[PDB]
Amino acid sequence: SIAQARKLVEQLKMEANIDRIKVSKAAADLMAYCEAHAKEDPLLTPVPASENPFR
Amino acid sequence: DQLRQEAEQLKNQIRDARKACADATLSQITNNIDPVGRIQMRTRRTLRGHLAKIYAMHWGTDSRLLVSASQDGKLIIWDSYTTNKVHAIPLRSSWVMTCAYAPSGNYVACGGLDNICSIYNLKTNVRVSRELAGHTGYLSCCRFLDDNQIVTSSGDTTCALWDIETGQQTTTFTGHTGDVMSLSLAPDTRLFVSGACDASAKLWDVREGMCRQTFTGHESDINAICFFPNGNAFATGSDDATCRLFDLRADQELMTYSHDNIICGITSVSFSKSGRLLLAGYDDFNCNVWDALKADRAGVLAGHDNRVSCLGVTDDGMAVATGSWDSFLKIWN
Amino acid sequence: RNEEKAQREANKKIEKQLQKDKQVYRATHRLLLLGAGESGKSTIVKQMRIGIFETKFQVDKVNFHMFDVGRDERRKWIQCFNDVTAIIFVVASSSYNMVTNRLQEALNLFKSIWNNRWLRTISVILFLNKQDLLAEKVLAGKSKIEDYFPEFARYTTPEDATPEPGEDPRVTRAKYFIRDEFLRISTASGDGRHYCYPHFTCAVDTENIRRVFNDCRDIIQRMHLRQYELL
Amino acid sequence: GMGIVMSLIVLAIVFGNVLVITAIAKFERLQTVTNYFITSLACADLVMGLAVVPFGAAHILTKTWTFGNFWCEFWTSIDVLCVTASIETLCVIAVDRYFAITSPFKYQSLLTKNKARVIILMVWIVSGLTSFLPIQMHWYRATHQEAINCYAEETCCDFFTNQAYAIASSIVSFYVPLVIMVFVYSRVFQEAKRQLQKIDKSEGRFHEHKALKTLGIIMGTFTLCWLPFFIVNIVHVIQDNLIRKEVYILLNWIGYVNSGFNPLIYCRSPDFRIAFQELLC
Ligand SMILES: Nc1nc2c(ncn2[C@@H]2O[C@H](COP(=O)(O)OP(=O)(O)OP(=O)(O)O)[C@@H](O)[C@H]2O)c(=O)[nH]1
Ligand SMILES: CN[C@@H]1CCc2c(ccc(O)c2O)[C@H]1O
Numbered sequence: 001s002i003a004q005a006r007k008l009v010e011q012l013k014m015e016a017n018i019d020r021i022k023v024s025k026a027a028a029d030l031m032a033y034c035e036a037h038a039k040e041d042p043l044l045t046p047v048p049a050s051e052n053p054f055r
Numbered sequence: 056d057q058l059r060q061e062a063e064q065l066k067n068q069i070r071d072a073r074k075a076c077a078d079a080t081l082s083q084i085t086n087n088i089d090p091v092g093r094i095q096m097r098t099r100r101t102l103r104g105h106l107a108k109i110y111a112m113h114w115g116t117d118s119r120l121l122v123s124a125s126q127d128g129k130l131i132i133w134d135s136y137t138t139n140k141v142h143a144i145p146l147r148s149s150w151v152m153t154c155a156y157a158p159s160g161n162y163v164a165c166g167g168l169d170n171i172c173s174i175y176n177l178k179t180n181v182r183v184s185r186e187l188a189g190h191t192g193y194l195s196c197c198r199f200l201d202d203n204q205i206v207t208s209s210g211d212t213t214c215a216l217w218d219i220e221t222g223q224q225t226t227t228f229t230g231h232t233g234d235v236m237s238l239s240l241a242p243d244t245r246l247f248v249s250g251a252c253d254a255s256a257k258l259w260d261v262r263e264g265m266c267r268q269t270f271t272g273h274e275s276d277i278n279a280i281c282f283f284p285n286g287n288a289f290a291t292g293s294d295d296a297t298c299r300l301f302d303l304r305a306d307q308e309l310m311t312y313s314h315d316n317i318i319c320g321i322t323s324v325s326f327s328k329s330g331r332l333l334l335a336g337y338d339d340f341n342c343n344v345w346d347a348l349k350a351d352r353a354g355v356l357a358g359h360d361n362r363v364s365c366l367g368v369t370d371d372g373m374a375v376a377t378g379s380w381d382s383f384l385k386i387w388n
Numbered sequence: 389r390n391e392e393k394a395q396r397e398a399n400k401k402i403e404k405q406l407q408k409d410k411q412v413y414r415a416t417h418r419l420l421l422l423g424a425g426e427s428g429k430s431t432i433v434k435q436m437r438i439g440i441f442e443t444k445f446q447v448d449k450v451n452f453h454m455f456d457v458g459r460d461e462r463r464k465w466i467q468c469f470n471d472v473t474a475i476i477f478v479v480a481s482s483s484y485n486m487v488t489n490r491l492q493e494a495l496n497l498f499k500s501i502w503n504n505r506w507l508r509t510i511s512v513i514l515f516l517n518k519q520d521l522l523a524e525k526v527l528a529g530k531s532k533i534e535d536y537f538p539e540f541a542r543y544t545t546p547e548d549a550t551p552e553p554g555e556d557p558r559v560t561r562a563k564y565f566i567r568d569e570f571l572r573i574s575t576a577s578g579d580g581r582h583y584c585y586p587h588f589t590c591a592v593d594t595e596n597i598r599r600v601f602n603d604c605r606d607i608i609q610r611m612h613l614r615q616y617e618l619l
Numbered sequence: 620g621m622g623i624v625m626s627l628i629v630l631a632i633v634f635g636n637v638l639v640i641t642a643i644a645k646f647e648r649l650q651t652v653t654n655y656f657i658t659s660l661a662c663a664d665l666v667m668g669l670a671v672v673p674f675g676a677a678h679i680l681t682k683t684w685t686f687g688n689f690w691c692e693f694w695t696s697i698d699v700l701c702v703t704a705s706i707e708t709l710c711v712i713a714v715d716r717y718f719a720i721t722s723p724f725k726y727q728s729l730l731t732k733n734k735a736r737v738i739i740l741m742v743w744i745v746s747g748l749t750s751f752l753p754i755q756m757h758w759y760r761a762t763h764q765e766a767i768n769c770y771a772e773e774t775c776c777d778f779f780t781n782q783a784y785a786i787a788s789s790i791v792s793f794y795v796p797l798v799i800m801v802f803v804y805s806r807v808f809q810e811a812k813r814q815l816q817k818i819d820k821s822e823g824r825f826h827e828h829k830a831l832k833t834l835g836i837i838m839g840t841f842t843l844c845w846l847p848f849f850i851v852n853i854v855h856v857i858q859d860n861l862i863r864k865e866v867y868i869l870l871n872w873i874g875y876v877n878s879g880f881n882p883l884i885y886c887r888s889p890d891f892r893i894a895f896q897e898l899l900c
Contacts, residue, residue, distance in 0.1 A: 005058035005062065009062055009065070011230070012062060012066065012069075013065065016065060016069055016072070018268070018306065021076065022076050022305075023076060023078060023080075023305045023309065024084065026305045027079075027081045030285065030330075031088075033284075033330065034348060037330070038329060040328065042328075042373055042388075043332060043373075043375065044091065044327065053373065
């Protein structure tokens, strides 16, 4: 109906104004986080069988 | 009809805005990182006892206990280390499509085709404690925000936040066009995202009670969604055999995961502890292990005789568990 | 140390309970009741009894379990019903002159159900209600079916047609024409994996349960015959 | 000259049976109540092809038994045991098909994993009762001069039996598991024909040889393999000096080949095909 079209207009109006950053900074942040937590996950690096609780 | 012109004008305006902010693609920056390499995994435990196909499972907060639901109408709480059962809760309705495990470890909830979410008390044996109603469509997922309030998403294009003590809706989230299929909460529990059936994932703010953003990268139904450990990104899996990594601050997608030899849908998506590996289930009777920053396959988790419908990773990042329609659960490592 | 023994005892008790429940689970047959609105889906269910509305009945020491769903143009939940014994389809045969005439929508729904990916090997039991309403309008009636269906002119009564006593040669044509409009869509894409069983149903009828029982028995027998490569 | 064909037959018997056993054991999707009987048949055929065929080939080529009396009696007893156990399993499979087809609503309750093991063990017990007991202890021995002459010799290993045992073993091993199979397959064919006729009556306008062909292979291979031997066996006892030794051993060896065709007959399902493609490919 007419209103459902109208509502889209106000919300879309809200999404339009928002503070956005360059994708390079976000990519660098994700890379930095992945490199910072790199050595603290047994899934990526197979730990020795001594500490494995499933073995 | 003035609005159709108006709305169209705004959608055109945002697309130019997101475009300007593309200093460089993520694949361009991530080019010289040493590859993860081949990832070899072997099953450690096999849990059996379910009478019918499995649709959902959820790991406990202690990385020790987990719950699962099947079409036989029965919830079972296993013991991952000692591969033996602990509980077995019957159900009033035989069709269940979701389950959850409370962060405090005292309650377990489940919903299904019948439009009611039920909460059970485990530390009293186990008897139904509260029944929540108000949804006009079948439930798809539910997650325990805390020990007193739960957020659910149903098939009537709505999501809501409940209050267990009083049993009445507190806030209602609307704006989707098609059915809602999955959701995931932020690590600090202030925001959550949902994947609809209209190829559009939205962001909500329980406190704001209002939508903030929307992402429309896909072209088919969205089946699952997972949230990056950082809190600034999330990943999605749809019926077009693709996975896409969106972003919050950049407000646009960064990379897509797909292969030319697979044409089946996607059922579940999950991350690892560090967010370097993106594990995603498929309808090809097996699972795949992706690479978050380079989009290169690094392993296959095969061994299931039917489609994979569930996937979860322990909070300790030790083991990954999968569920299939073959009525069997597995624990990989 | 004794905690492990207590946990093992609990495991054993749960396993015994599950083993007890498995036989009862395997014994029953699950049926799905699906149809359009004003079809009569609720009634047929009432005769069998004497968000999801379940029901159970037992015939000849065999127990059945019926489920009625529900309202969406796309039904995603239908992927959960790929293990049922059969799908019961209920359609109002007298509504060709109502409201996109209600029949063509029913035909489109049936075609959508037949070609679904998750229901490749599920048979369909088809019920044609309101036979009584159709005849009163079809014969001694104001309007013809042709106006709403041009193909009625180039259609002859099937020779195999077997009219029951006291019925005119026009109403038989209408009934068999309506039945063939569904039989056409059933035969072309099956591949022999699944079949359809047409039936004629009215309000004053008491043999529906026996018909369902016989159809389920035939479905099981045909599946077993095809499995062993004798059909 | 014969060595090549005997080795080929032995390898063919062993390979198919071991492949079927491994395929059934490794994969959990094939563990079905019906598949236990096929497993038992595979074990019986493997034991036969590994025990009786090679030593029989050695005996026929050498024309002189190089073992003692005990080994010859043991070999004869294991031959009888394997042959007897390889047919009642086929009869049980036919009866299982009959029950599954003609009684669709009671198949699940009547046949359970607990009853299948009992039936299989009963079949093996009745097979072993008529093979080891009457042979290992001397009841198969004959009284005529050639029989005792061969019994005295330590290097003579041939076959000589009385009328009673020769009739009882044949009746237990062949005819009883034959009339049952004939009746069962007649009933199954009738049911299949009725189903096809009903289908044609219901919807023939828009749209019986498969069942006939399948029953053709299933019955014909077994009947042609095992029929002439189990009549010449009675013939050469009911009257003397009509059946030559060479034709007898030839018919017996023709009967042995039937244990190599069962994997090609009862394991043609597409699930078995994908299982066989999964490994050793
Ligand atoms: N005249 C007539 N009325 C019928 C017949 N079958 C059902 N009804 C009437 O239909 C009324 C309501 O519709 P139903 O046919 O029961 O169907 P329903 O389940 O309510 O409708 P939907 O679920 O929306 O398909 C009942 O009060 C019945 O008396 C029939 O064959 N003839
Ligand atoms: C040495 N070959 C044996 C000799 C007699 C015999 C066989 C098979 C079944 C029987 O009941 C028998 O009495 C043959 O396989």
